[PDB]
Amino acid sequence: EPEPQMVLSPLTSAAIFLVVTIDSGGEDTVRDLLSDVASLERAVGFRAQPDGRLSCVTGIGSEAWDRLFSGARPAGLHPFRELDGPVHRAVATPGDLLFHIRASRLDLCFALATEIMGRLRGAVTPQDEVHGFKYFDERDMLGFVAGTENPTGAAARRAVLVGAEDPAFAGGSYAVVQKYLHDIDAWEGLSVEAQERVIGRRKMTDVELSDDVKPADSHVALTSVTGPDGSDLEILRDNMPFGSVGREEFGTYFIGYARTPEVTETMLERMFLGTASAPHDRILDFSTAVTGSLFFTPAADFLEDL
Amino acid sequence: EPEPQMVLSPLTSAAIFLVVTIDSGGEDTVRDLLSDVASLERAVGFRAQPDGRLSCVTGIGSEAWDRLFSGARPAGLHPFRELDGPVHRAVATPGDLLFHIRASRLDLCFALATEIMGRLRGAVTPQDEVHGFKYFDERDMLGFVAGTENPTGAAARRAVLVGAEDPAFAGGSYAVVQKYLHDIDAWEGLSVEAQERVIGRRKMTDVELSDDVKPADSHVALTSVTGPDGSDLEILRDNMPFGSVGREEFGTYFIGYARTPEVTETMLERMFLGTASAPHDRILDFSTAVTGSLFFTPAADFLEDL
Amino acid sequence: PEPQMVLSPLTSAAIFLVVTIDSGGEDTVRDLLSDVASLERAVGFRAQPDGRLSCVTGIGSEAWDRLFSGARPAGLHPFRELDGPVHRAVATPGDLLFHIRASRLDLCFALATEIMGRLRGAVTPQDEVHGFKYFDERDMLGFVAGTENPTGAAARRAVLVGAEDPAFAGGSYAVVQKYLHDIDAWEGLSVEAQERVIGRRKMTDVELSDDVKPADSHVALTSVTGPDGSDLEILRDNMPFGSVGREEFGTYFIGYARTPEVTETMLERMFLGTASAPHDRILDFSTAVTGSLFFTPAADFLED
Amino acid sequence: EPEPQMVLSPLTSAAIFLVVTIDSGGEDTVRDLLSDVASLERAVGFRAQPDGRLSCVTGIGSEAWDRLFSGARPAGLHPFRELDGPVHRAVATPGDLLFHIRASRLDLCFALATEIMGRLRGAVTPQDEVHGFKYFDERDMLGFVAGTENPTGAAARRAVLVGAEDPAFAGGSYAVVQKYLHDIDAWEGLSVEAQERVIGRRKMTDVELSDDVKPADSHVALTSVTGPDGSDLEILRDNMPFGSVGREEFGTYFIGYARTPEVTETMLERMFLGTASAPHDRILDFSTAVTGSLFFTPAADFLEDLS
Amino acid sequence: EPEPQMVLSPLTSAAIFLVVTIDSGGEDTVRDLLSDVASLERAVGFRAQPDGRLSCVTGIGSEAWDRLFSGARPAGLHPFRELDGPVHRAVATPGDLLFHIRASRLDLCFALATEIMGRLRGAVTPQDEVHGFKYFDERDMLGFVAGTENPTGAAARRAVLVGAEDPAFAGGSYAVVQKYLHDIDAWEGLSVEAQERVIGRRKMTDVELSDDVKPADSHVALTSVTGPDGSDLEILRDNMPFGSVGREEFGTYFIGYARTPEVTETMLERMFLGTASAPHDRILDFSTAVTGSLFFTPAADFLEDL
Amino acid sequence: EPEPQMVLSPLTSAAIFLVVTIDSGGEDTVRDLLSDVASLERAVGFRAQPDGRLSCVTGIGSEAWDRLFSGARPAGLHPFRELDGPVHRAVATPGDLLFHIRASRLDLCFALATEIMGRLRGAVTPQDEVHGFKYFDERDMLGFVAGTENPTGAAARRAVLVGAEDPAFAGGSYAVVQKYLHDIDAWEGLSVEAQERVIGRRKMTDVELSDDVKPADSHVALTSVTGPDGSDLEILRDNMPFGSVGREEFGTYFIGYARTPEVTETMLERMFLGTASAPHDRILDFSTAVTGSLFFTPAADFLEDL
Ligand code: HEM
Ligand code: HEM
Ligand code: HEM
Ligand code: HEM
Ligand SMILES: [Mg+2]
Ligand SMILES: [Mg+2]
């Protein structure tokens, strides 16, 4: 049975997201680092266990894959597709490698980031670095609980991990990232009731709005998708607030894992392009995407063997 | 007894340092915020007690004092004094207000910073914003334990709080801040034993080097100061690592509190200008100061009674 | 099939809610059942990982026939009243059980509030108990409670319906009884006399050896062996409760099993006695004031 | 300095409030129990330290004081004064002894309540027993954070503990209790902004409303009181949710400690009788007081030195 | 105010008790270590704060005091007085220095013991070393709660710290130690009710037996002492279980702190020699003392000024 | 179907290792105790759950197996093989039963050890008893992190548990124990860099030395072993510091579990007897083995069915 990366992590209150491009000639250095990244994760994290909860999920973009590896490609790997909606746009931005670093403390994330980037200096150019922090009651930058309807247990494994449909890549996953900046002033001018109509859940109690009252352009309504057999299509999300008070930057860093990118891409199409009943996701009236990238996160043993 | 701000805080693993200047006409907005800052600290922090450990210490610079208040000035308040040493320089940079925000989690620091800056928008210009994180075993960016010889209990109160020498300002303190960037590549080229000779303490065990082995230009030797009667002159420090892996920025944010700025200024003169036996503090061969400011942190009731 | 959270980690707080379904309340009940897992997530998620909030939902025999058509679970029937020579196990009404557990009573209460909010006008409350465990896992009699519960695979095999009733695989059967204790009479016994009642040492929680353990001790009467000589096991999560002002000092008994026959055989031994034991000596200090049986379906049964 | 009881406790998530009356002839049994209550607190609590945080504050009503003790009375002790407002009433109900029992866990509260009541059986009649639990984010039954503006440290000592003004009773305090039941249906029919105008603070963030927006009949405006010199008069509160979902009982148990009952009584008068600018505290349109009692909580050494 | 050592510590679950004798010629090495012991405590303990709660109380015996120091001596300092009762004996055993090391974890105790003994190698001979552990519910090796009636707060300071009666030594205390081994087989032959009559408290609930049932030769009755003016004479105890299962050694390490040794010695006399109404403390029928030593624990600043 | 003992335990900060021999005639008493050991574990441990994490792993030696049981032997069970190297020796010492007791607190370990030894008095002779404690940062007595490269999850199950190759004993494991005493004086005379060359990892950061610099006689190089198919052969280790400061005993108690003893024995041979490129493991120049024994730890159901 192939060993996945730590895509299914315990709850963590801190994260670093690192997106880089691989410079010309940097391929060999990158391959060496990939074969050591799990041993660096253990080195940094083991002595802080059990409370540290340090993990690193490593992802590779479509164009980078062809530069690094010969043989088969993962079936669903392609560049992030830009969505040019009537009002809102989901931009595509460059990224060859993702490091999704999570722990209970930002310092542990930083120590691992420092070791990873130390080995890659001269081979990569940083595109994005975000230091994320979750609020103490699992709330996001909009004041709502984040993570409630994530799948757990076997339902999570089924939703996230590549299996028999792409057997050479079993135990992998696909990550989509988007960095969002919020208009906090406009958001906080809404009443709580109007915010609940945007999200589709109660703010304080986190109870879902009933079907008869939930707006068709609420976030929860548009990101609820049923498959060909009427089962729910699910993804696993670990959105993280970030910001700078001096620069008035108040953000949500979105990351979503799925067994195939088609699930995530269908959700994004509904959000940005809308449906028969909804012009677009009302969350986008307060949130602007400034990055967008797609990565394949291979099985841990795939990385170890190169 | 006047009530001090939370200068003597429990150990915290997260901090935000905010330094701002007061714009033309911003005085009244600032005074209103100062009279509310303790109540904002309670609002953000109380529901996360007892583990949150959220506090905010507010400081006011020399020039800002005269713009905000009439009547007496604190006796020791003056602008930061630039030190132009033979090799190393301690720069002065602008700052009218300091907010030293501490907690066990960065999100609580950020929430308070957001409320404070929300009330000040349009009245202040940000000069510096640093998000600090301490390593899980109380280590700093150089890999040494940080805080070991800080005073505690009654010795700390005596060292930090203004008393009968300046009775109108009893329960206040003086804060000096400097942001340092490290040359980590050069530091990590030293052996552990060579690093220990720079600091003056063992790296793994944090035991002080004996007087016969401790170099005269070690950090602990230069920052050890005796008064006219041979008593130790002490300050309270809460130095915090910070940085950005993508920008190769690895820093220490220095903050030191003392009952009179003369103690901290004597330490800085020994570090930057040296003594008969030491050209300068060897820590400065790996650390460059890029900011420097001095603030008076009044008793909490002084702020409240505006 | 995915079970409900019958096998929970240890919790220090609980709310037990038993209700009857009023005439015309069926539809409101069915709607709540299809939402109960989503309400559990909504209340519990923001207090993770320490909250450990869960809700196990059970349905009685008479209620089942009112709510659902098609197959019944094979073992579902009303609680059987036991009229012993001295002690009686009463049957009391109950159509739905909510067994709510967490590390803190406030989280239990928040979920109970949301559940009862959705059911108002459709149900009548029969019982509500707010349970608390003592800091050293002791019960109201001063003994450690839960020691011999099965764990891991043995727990799954003992508690979850399987291939013997395949349409209801992943379900379980819950028996509840509320007991009030005579604490004055109990505390008049020596520790050694109490140990002979229970069958375990009080301070150290070591089982009394076979040569000293009385036949009418609680542990001896609730030890039952199957056709192949294996132990028949149940999973228990007994909770203290009470009111100091009313001198009410209680144990809320709940036992889960794959078939109610195991639990019912234990109860018959306790209340009716055997050739070797008049009755369970624990019953000389404990009176049952409720008794109900529920089937707790697989979580996916409720969600559909 | 005389030693207070644990009036200023760390934050606790569980409480039991026990109010009893002393039966005729029960005085001697009561006095014996009072001289042992500290030792019972240690017996129950010590083996659960450091996490248990078990404490018991013992209070004695005005009429009970006269029955138990033959010497001088605390200067501010009198029976709770009923407030008969144009709309709302603060009832006075019987109570001779208060046991305010706090810990991190309800079982530790219950163990101590059991030991106390075991010694008093036959000498007292129970009037009220409430098992309180705090919501995990310090919220009350109305969904608002409770405790935010309580004084801390030296300001709390100065506000709560009797000093030089009544030297024989230094280290004591005065407790007012009221059990409130809420109309949760009516409350949940308000918008969040309408709730915020009732309380005087933002619901989600717990930031106080500006002076320009905060209504005169908000709870925070009516319970804000300044003294003869313009200093704030403060009390220490440890309000606790309680209830029963089956009976639709959703409550707040109010307890407030103060160095003199006059501060707490002034706040209650403003709430129930109103001011020039406010008919009454709007929180009372959603909250009914069903008990009301006043107690003196003596210094610990006063209790220990008894026959 | 003179600063005491950490005689009144928060609750700790681990301890090391180290008793040594000073070898001929070892005086100078010992004096140097004493002047450094608080700085060693900070070095070992700081990086495990706030939960470590590492402290070291240092005591000096009567004969050692006269070897190390000249001039005035603490008023009550003498060698432990052997008690030769009709049945039971309290032995005096050699000991010049006590290190009473406490923390929430044994490893912190061990690290500090290692540093202390490292500085003293060649100057001292070990007489006793005990590694103590508390049971999870504060119980001792007899199964009873230990520590319940210790004084707290102000009453503890008054009972333990030397004051105006010996002003040159204000802020000190006197420690008596005795290592006890228990005859667990004999003890476990009693019923619980018979055990309770030995101790004077209920076993499970730790409620004191009422005056009408408490025997005169119970442990709590013999260790309850009133002074000529009616006040309770109290000591502070931090008894620790210890043992070795293979050697069937089950013990209690007794340590009692008091402002004068007269209080502790009066308790010991009542235990071992008895009263008019009690032949001896019944706890001694199941407990044998194998060490006995007395130490003065000076104010912290006395040690620092060497 | 078979239920293993708790070989794969969560991390624990305390342990007791008890090794006994079975006296002539003690076999029946031992068999009775083995059938009850799981129920004693529950009795002691249940009331401290969920934080106690008390477990006991029971092992049986080769000669004891033949005295206790008839029918099949586990295929790999034999007495520990003495290794007589040119410089260093791995001695074989007597041991019939191992009790490897772990918990979050030493109290719980001690209570269970007391109950076990209580049942076996008169049937067994203690050979070794060690009370282990972890340093707060997972460090050993040499100052290095211990446990970093242990297998986890499925890789741990595959490495440790007997399966289809010995089907009657599926769910069992083999334990090798050695008690080591260190020469701490000689070790602390090395520079940190010289220590790192002994171990094969960086001291402070726990990063493995790269292949070009790692010495062939480093500990990590000699204990890295590849199988016939090029896979890494792994074991699960739960080494625990122990000691006595007064006797200058500073130790590491080695325990290693594996599905077959040949893996552990190949590592030992490389350490003690060396390779073409390394005379012996350099860790042995600072570490002396004073015990050595091998045990089979059966499935839990094997013990219960006695
Ligand atoms: C007043 C009610 C009760 C009290 C206070 C109580 C208490 C206890 C205690 C202290 C134990 C020993 C520790 C443990 O394993 O939990 C025990 C064991 C047990 N109890 Fe009860 N119990 C009660 C009622 C019941 C009822 C009604 C049943 C069955 C229908 C039951 C079945 C069991 C079983 C099966 C055991 C495990 C026996 C064994 O060691 O195999 N109990 N109970
Ligand atoms: C139904 C009963 C009550 C509820 C639900 C309630 C709730 C609250 C809330 C949510 C706050 C704001 C947060 C805080 O500082 O705790 C508050 C503040 C306060 N309450 Fe109440 N309360 C009640 C009864 C009372 C009573 C009866 C009194 C006085 C006799 C009182 C005195 C106060 C005071 C002095 C404050 C702080 C006001 C300020 O200075 O900011 N409360 N209460
Ligand atoms: C022999 C081993 C010892 C054991 C196992 C032991 C055990 C206990 C226990 C279980 C208690 C009751 C709970 C408490 O308040 O701590 C206690 C109380 C006490 N013990 Fe001991 N003890 C021992 C030796 C000593 C010695 C040698 C002294 C005095 C020299 C002493 C002085 C006290 C005192 C003063 C109390 C408090 C009595 C009261 O005022 O209530 N103990 N001890
Ligand atoms: C003096 C006794 C010992 C000490 C202080 C010691 C210490 C260590 C240290 C510090 C590590 C590096 C971090 C890690 O745990 O992975 C290590 C790794 C290891 N040790 Fe030891 N050890 C000792 C004895 C043994 C023995 C006797 C064996 C085998 C029989 C052994 C097998 C291993 C293995 C397999 C590894 C992992 C190597 C790798 O794949 O990276 N050790 N040891
Ligand atoms: Mg009978
Ligand atoms: Mg014996």
Residue numbers in the entry:
A (entry chain B), B (entry chain E), E (entry chain A), F (entry chain C): 7 to 312
C (entry chain D): 8 to 311
D (entry chain F): 7 to 313
Please share excerpts from the published article on this structure.
To assess whether disruption of the Asp–Arg–Asn triad in DtpB leads to a wet distal heme pocket, microcrystals of each variant in the Fe(III)–heme state were produced and subjected to RT-SFX crystallography using a high viscosity extruder sample delivery system at the SACLA XFEL beamline BL2 EH3. For all variants, well-defined electron density peaks were present in the distal heme pocket, consistent with the presence of resident H2O molecules. In the D152A variant, three resident H2O molecules are accommodated, with two occupying the space left by the Asp152 side chain. In the D152A, D152A/N245A, and R243 variants, w1 is positioned close enough to the heme–Fe(III) to be a bonding interaction (average Fe(III)–OH2 distances within the DtpB hexamer assembly of 2.52, 2.83, and 2.28 Å, respectively). An obvious feature is that WT DtpB displays a single pKa, as opposed to the D152A and double variants, which display two pKa values. In the D152A and double variants, H2O2 would be expected to replace w1, leaving two water molecules in the pocket, both of which participate in an extended H-bonded network, thus supporting a view that H2O dipole orientations can compensate for a proton remaining on Fe(III)–H2O2 and therefore increasing the pKa. Thus, the D152A and D152A/N245A variants (fully wet) are almost fully populated at 76 and 93%, respectively, while the “semi-dry” N245A variant is 52% populated. Therefore, we conclude that by disrupting the Asp–Asn dyad, a wet distal heme pocket forms in the Fe(III)–heme state, which does not influence the efficiency of DtpB reacting with H2O2, indicating that Arg243 facilitates Compound I formation in DtpB regardless of whether the pocket is wet or dry.
